[PDB]
């Protein structure tokens, strides 16, 4: 009844789930597209054909085919991000948490997972929607989308592997929410999309893309923006990588069509085993198959779109963590370790800036180096480690987001900026890594509310503050509830943002302005010039 919902493509049977000494409705693994399998691998998604009988939506779906991180087997900090379900190319499903009793026509929030466009699943423990749905009385959807080659292999000109299909999967799940969320007590005219890292880049891509604009009301971007240097490639670079993928797998390369058909015969894991090989450099925070600037999903370059105001004009709320870079150093840079303080020698710092800014010539490397080195104390391994962490975080996440926020604000209808800098109580990773990539997510999804998870009282209270900011923003375009201490609008002139931690709200201005002028104005001009 409450659990039996007739949607436009057929009937779905949800399940009653327990949540914090209460209950709500969960509809898990709802198909939004035809399975993109067989001759459909690499192609645009097709809408899910209607089924008869009742779809069993009591259970999480398969995760998409992806690289699986095995660097630290057994370790919760890496393993929480890996698939917790069987992987299958048949993976285009969404999940819904509905407050019980069913609300009339409430704010909808649609979560878009990150994972670098090469991994991610809607079914991770940290994305369990039941807490945010219950606490904030919203309808929470998590979508999925193809990642890696399967989602982003790009041979522009071909209708067979056009590129961007993972982005179209997201848009098709959005369309499905627009067409069906009213059946779950959701208001399709009050949809917020939100996601982290690649999911945040994704959110900003749908703001930019004219085909996505009318499928949501408002947006939240966490530690990601569309212009991130790792978040897109040119059609020529996507093409090179796709030919190199085929080269790796002994494919016929005489034609797009021959390459594409060879690659469709390959077992999924065969694609995944060689995925990292197509990258043009030794690097970190670079992923193989990502969105392409194709002239279709994105009519023109992201920069020209941002400058002309060719994008959705609405309210956005976005921000970054203190130490975005540290996870990536740990994986790919010399001298770093999970099990030590990771004091970085000068030799390893040099080799790290090269890996961090793989597109830089020698002059740009020197420029980066000079900008983050304290020459009164250059053999300090602690300042060398933190310096590298800041390079990776500033270059890849913070400064692109600041460029996006400054460009967006000129045209949009209200910007709210945050700086997430809370030090964990349950320290999973070592201290040197600080406020890690993805850590704010636990707070957004209300995991600190679960007593069995052993967060502190101050963390429960912060999670509740964050959920309420997020949901209130989703409802109104403003994270603040009229009447009382206010998170102020980010404005072009004043550039105010807030810290998000367990202390009373403090307001600052010009987040990392000094390093971000280096990354957004001077380096690009140096690289354009030399």
Ligand X SMILES: *[C@@H]1O[C@H](CO)[C@@H](O)[C@H](O)[C@H]1NC(C)=O
- Could you give the residue numbers annotated as active site? 197, 324, 437
**Edge-to-edge order in the sheet of strand 54-56:** 4-7, 10-13, 54-56
**Contact (Cβ atoms closer than 8 angstroms) between residue 36 and residue 146:** yes
C-alpha–C-alpha distance, residues 339 and 149, integer Å: 33
Q: Which stretch binds a second copy (CB under 8 A): 120-128, 362-370, 385-393, 459-467?
A: 362-370
Phi, psi of 232 (to 5 degrees): -150, 160
39 binds ligand X (CB under 6 A): no
Q: Which residues of 213-244 are buried (b: 16+ CB within 10 A; e: fewer)?
A: eebbbbbbbbbbbbbbbbbbbebebbbebbbb
76 binds ligand X (CB under 6 A): no
The residues in 232-261 that bind K ion, with binding defined as CB under 5 A, are 257
522 binds ligand AFT (CB under 6 A): no
Contact string (CB under 6 A) for ligand X, positions 451-480, x = contact: ---x--------------------------
363 binds a second copy (CB under 8 A): yes
CB of 363 to ligand AFT, least distance (A): 22
Q: Which does 56 bind (CB under 5 to 8 A by kind): Cl ion, ligand AFT, ligand X, none?
A: ligand X
CB of 207 to ligand AFT, least distance (A): 25
CA distance to 55, 346, 380, 383, 476, per residue, from 377 (Å) = 64, 11, 6, 8, 50
Map residue 317 onto helix, strand or coil.
strand
C-alpha–C-alpha distance, residues 116 and 326, integer Å: 15
**Contact (Cβ atoms closer than 8 angstroms) between residue 97 and residue 24:** yes
494 binds a second copy (CB under 8 A): no
507 binds a second copy (CB under 8 A): no
301 binds ligand X (CB under 6 A): no
Among 264, 191, 276, CA closest to 41: 264
* C-alpha distance across the termini of the chain, in Å: 67
**Contact (Cβ atoms closer than 8 angstroms) between residue 133 and residue 24:** yes
Q: Which stretch binds ligand X (CB under 6 A): 51-59, 83-91, 261-269, 463-471?
A: 51-59
Contact string (CB under 6 A) for ligand AFT, positions 244-283, x = contact: --------------------------------x--x---x
Instruction: With CB under 5 A as the rule, give the number of residues binding K ion.
Output: 1
The nearer residue to ligand AFT, 184 or 328, going by C-beta atoms, is: 328
Q: Which residues bind ligand X (CB under 6 A)?
A: 13, 56, 58-59, 413-414, 454, 489
Q: Where does this chain bind a second copy (CB under 8 A)? A: 363, 366-367, 370, 374-376, 509-510, 513-514, 517-518, 521-522, 525-526, 529-530
């Amino acid at each position: 009844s409450e659990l039996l919902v007739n949607t436009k493509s057929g009937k779905v049977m949800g399940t009653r789930v327990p949540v914090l000494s209460s209950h709500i409705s969960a509809f898990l693994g709802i198909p939004f597209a035809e399975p993109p399998v067989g001759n459909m691998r690499f192609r645009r998604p097709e809408p899910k054909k209607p089924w008869s009988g009742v779809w069993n939506a009591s259970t999480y779906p398969n995760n998409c085919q992806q690289y699986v991180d095995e660097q630290f087997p057994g370790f919760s900090g890496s393993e929480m991000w890996n698939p917790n379900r069987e992987m299958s190319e048949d993976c285009l499903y969404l999940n819904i948490w509905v407050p019980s009793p069913r609300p009339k026509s409430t704010t909808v929030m649609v979560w878009i997972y990150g994972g670098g466009f090469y991994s991610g699943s809607s079914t991770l423990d940290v994305y369990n929607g039941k807490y945010l749905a219950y606490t904030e009385e919203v309808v929470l959807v998590s979508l999925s989308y193809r990642v890696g080659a399967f989602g982003f292999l790009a041979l522009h000109g071909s209708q067979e592997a056009p590129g961007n299909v993972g982005l179209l999967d997201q848009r098709m799940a959005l369309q499905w929410v627009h067409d069906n969320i009213q059946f779950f007590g959701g208001d399709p005219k009050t949809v917020t999309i939100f996601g982290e890292s690649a999911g945040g880049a994704s959110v900003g891509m749908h703001i930019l893309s004219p085909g996505s604009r009318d499928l949501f009301r408002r947006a939240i971007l966490q530690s990601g923006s569309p212009n991130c240097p790792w978040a897109s490639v040119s059609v020529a670079e996507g093409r090179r990588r796709a030919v190199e993928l085929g080269r790796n797998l002994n494919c016929n390369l005489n034609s797009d069509e021959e390459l594409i058909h060879c690659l469709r015969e390959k077992k999924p894991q065969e694609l995944i085993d060689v995925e990292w090989n197509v990258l043009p450099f030794d690097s970190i925070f670079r992923f193989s198959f990502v969105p392409v600037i194709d002239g279709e999903f994105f009519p023109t370059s992201l920069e020209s779109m941002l400058n002309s105001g060719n994008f959705k004009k609405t309210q956005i709320l976005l921000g970054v963590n203190k130490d975005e870079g540290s996870f990536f150093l740990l994986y790919g840079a010399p001298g770093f370790s999970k099990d030590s303080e990771s004091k970085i020698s000068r030799e390893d710092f040099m080799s790290g800036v090269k890996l961090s800014v793989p597109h830089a010539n020698d002059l740009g490397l020197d420029a980066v180096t000079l900008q983050y080195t304290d020459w009164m104390d250059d053999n300090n391994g602690i300042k060398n480690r933190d310096g590298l962490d800041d390079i990776v975080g500033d270059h890849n996440v913070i400064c692109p987001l600041m460029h996006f926020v400054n460009k967006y604000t000129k045209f949009g209808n209200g910007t709210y900026l945050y700086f997430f800098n809370h030090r964990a109580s349950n320290l999973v990773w070592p201290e040197w890594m600080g406020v890690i990539h993805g850590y704010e997510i636990e707070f957004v999804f209300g995991l600190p509310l679960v007593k069995e998870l052993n967060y502190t009282a101050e963390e429960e209270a912060l999670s509740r503050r964050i959920m309420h900011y997020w949901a209130t923003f989703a409802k109104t375009g403003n994270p603040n509830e009229p009447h009382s201490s206010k998170w102020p609008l980010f404005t072009t002139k004043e550039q105010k943002f807030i810290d998000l931690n367990t202390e009373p709200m403090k307001v600052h201005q010009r987040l990392r302005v000094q390093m971000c002028v280096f990354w957004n104005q001077f380096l690009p001009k140096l690289l354009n010039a030399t």
